[PDB]
Amino acid sequence: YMSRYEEITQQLIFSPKTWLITGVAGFIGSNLLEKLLKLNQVVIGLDNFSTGHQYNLDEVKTLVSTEQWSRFCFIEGDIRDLTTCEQVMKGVDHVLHQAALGSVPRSIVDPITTNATNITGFLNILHAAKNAQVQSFTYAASSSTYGDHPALPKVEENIGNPLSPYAVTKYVNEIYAQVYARTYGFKTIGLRYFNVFGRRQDPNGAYAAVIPKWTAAMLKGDDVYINGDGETSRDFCYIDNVIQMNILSALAKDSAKDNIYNVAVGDRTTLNELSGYIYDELNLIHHIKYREFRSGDVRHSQADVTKAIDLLKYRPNIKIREGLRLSMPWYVRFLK
Amino acid sequence: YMSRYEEITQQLIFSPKTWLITGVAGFIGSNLLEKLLKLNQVVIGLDNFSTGHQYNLDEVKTLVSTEQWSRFCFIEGDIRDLTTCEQVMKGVDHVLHQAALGSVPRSIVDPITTNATNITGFLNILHAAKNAQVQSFTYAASSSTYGDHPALPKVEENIGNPLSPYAVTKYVNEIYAQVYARTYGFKTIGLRYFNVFGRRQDPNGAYAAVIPKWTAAMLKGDDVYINGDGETSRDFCYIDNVIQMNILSALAKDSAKDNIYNVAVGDRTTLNELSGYIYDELNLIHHIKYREFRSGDVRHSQADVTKAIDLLKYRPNIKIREGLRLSMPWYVRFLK
Ligand SMILES: NC(=O)c1ccc[n+]([C@@H]2O[C@H](COP(=O)([O-])OP(=O)(O)OC[C@H]3O[C@@H](n4cnc5c(N)ncnc54)[C@H](O)[C@@H]3O)[C@@H](O)[C@H]2O)c1
Ligand SMILES: NC(=O)c1ccc[n+]([C@@H]2O[C@H](COP(=O)([O-])OP(=O)(O)OC[C@H]3O[C@@H](n4cnc5c(N)ncnc54)[C@H](O)[C@@H]3O)[C@@H](O)[C@H]2O)c1
Ligand SMILES: O=c1ccn([C@@H]2O[C@H](COP(=O)(O)OP(=O)(O)O)[C@@H](O)[C@H]2O)c(=O)[nH]1
């Protein structure tokens, strides 16, 4: 049971609010959309369809009622444009900021456009929210910001040298949010996501994440490549745990704001054992090569989620094996 | 005898290089231009006259020869446009990046404009220089990067939380420069300036610095305002020490790069005593109210400049007294 999360969702159903989700047509954003509409929230969505898709919006339309879909206003637009940010902020109570161009290799190859979307666009959105006096502000940050700190598990207070432009941009979101608390009284929550996965995570394109990438390949019968020796390890985190942490953050008591939380489950899986689990799960639904290390890439990752457990009553419920089992049916339909 | 600095300066007289100076129409920038043309260098300038002034350029042309001036190619333009950055980088050897919007209180009122010039702009210039493979890249950092850290004097390796939107931008400049060393092998030198003063430091405008602001006010018989009890203290640094550090850094050996250096004198002067020293030096060239602390002010500021002295052979030869004597005539003229 996710008991605090249950309570807060009950509050929201009784007294519905207006939410802004940026990055709404993406993986996490469209999952957030799905959950908030199922709670009868009024949602304003902003996306530029850079890495996101019209079809993710279509899918969510089919998963919620007509009345629930009638409360969603989608705005095609770009967080880089301050005017657009100010416009979509109007009457908003809660901000969930997911719009960014992710990927560590992407930041290395084009630190410029990435800087514009992940720093300028984050600040545009943070400033507009402040000026609009929204009730809350929760933004996607990154475990990549631990960088080369060798300690396991990772605790929020202790970060190393950033190994990529992506690590920098997400770090800078954190520092702007802390300064906004200091200088305007404007209190936010940054969510350091660790390797999120699940439905509507894009399997296609040069930057696809390992889980949908591999699922896609295992299904096609293609080669499954491993960047390095496969001992590189991660805390894979099923999207529902992320959806919990956003909603808990949006309604956090004030003393729990102006903080950073790890968002994960606390487990460590190497690339090797994941190759296993994925094959296993897909094969129950009836259907290997080493290359060099990926540069900028973090070696090992396991979160410590005590802080979120403590301060927000976060209850991570779905672990890597069940999450894969929950996701593979989606990948089949989508890729059939 | 600044033997190292004199040595380097004698070499440049004999073997001219091409320098790019951003923020060339500004205080520190036009001081750098004056010095480099006097050494017969080739200088490309870039400035959008946002806080800088055509009249500073006109002034530098009065101080150098036709043939020296002939070697200054001036571009009116904006570091926020990447094409403009790459265009001024062509054939450059040494980059002196000074273009930015200074001022803590400016950044509190308008964090977006400050971000755009100080982060996007900086990154455009760093990226263009990396792509053009210049020999050296030296940028204007800030003592605001010390943030809330309680050490005093300030030493480069130990910094705290940044305390305003401006301070975030200047810290992010050093972070990007370190990640660029790490990821592309492009080694830069960041110069944490402390309270620079001297000729062509603008005395006019809401954001004028204390020494020119007070100087203007004393000449006019305007009220000299002291924010606080006047015991507040700074490590005021005459421009020629800053010019010195820029040229030592441009010609630094490789092991001296990817490093930050404080640029100041190492001395601490109070606001009360400064008012006294500005009065005295203006009086030999023949011709006060107490209000509340500026908010987000820093109480005491003083650099440890050991690392510069050691690694770069810096000589902080002009102290505040001498510097104010040298500057006072420039203000008298500029004002009558
Ligand atoms: N998936 C993960 O493992 C993970 C890990 C760390 C951080 N994050 C962060 O979580 C957030 C969501 O990531 P995701 O994994 O859903 O990826 P995603 O690419 O599926 O979604 C990002 C969405 O942002 C939109 N977008 C991008 N730039 C935009 C702009 N300038 N203006 C308007 N919209 C823009 C895209 O079209 C896309 O729909 C991002 O901030 C990302 O950096 C995700
Ligand atoms: N003077 C000090 O005490 C001090 C202290 C800390 C840091 N600095 C830094 O030193 C550098 C030089 O500062 P300064 O004191 O001479 O200030 P300044 O305002 O006199 O000069 C900055 C110059 O940059 C130009 N500029 C600003 N934005 C630009 C843009 N987008 N494109 C092109 N040109 C632009 C201005 O027009 C101006 O000529 C800055 O990076 C500043 O932040 C100065
Ligand atoms: O086809 C692939 C794609 C990714 N990876 C590796 O999987 C890990 C997780 O990468 P992902 O892009 O999913 O997330 P990251 O940890 O960068 O956010 C990284 O070490 C990648 O180099 C891999 O071995 N093969």
Ligand SMILES: O=c1ccn([C@@H]2O[C@H](COP(=O)(O)OP(=O)(O)O)[C@@H](O)[C@H]2O)c(=O)[nH]1
């Ligand atoms: O009219 C003025 C302007 C500034 N200051 C003070 O001078 C110090 C340094 O101010 P400045 O703006 O020169 O540079 P900063 O330290 O912000 O970079 C601070 O104590 C200010 O409160 C002052 O007492 N009176």
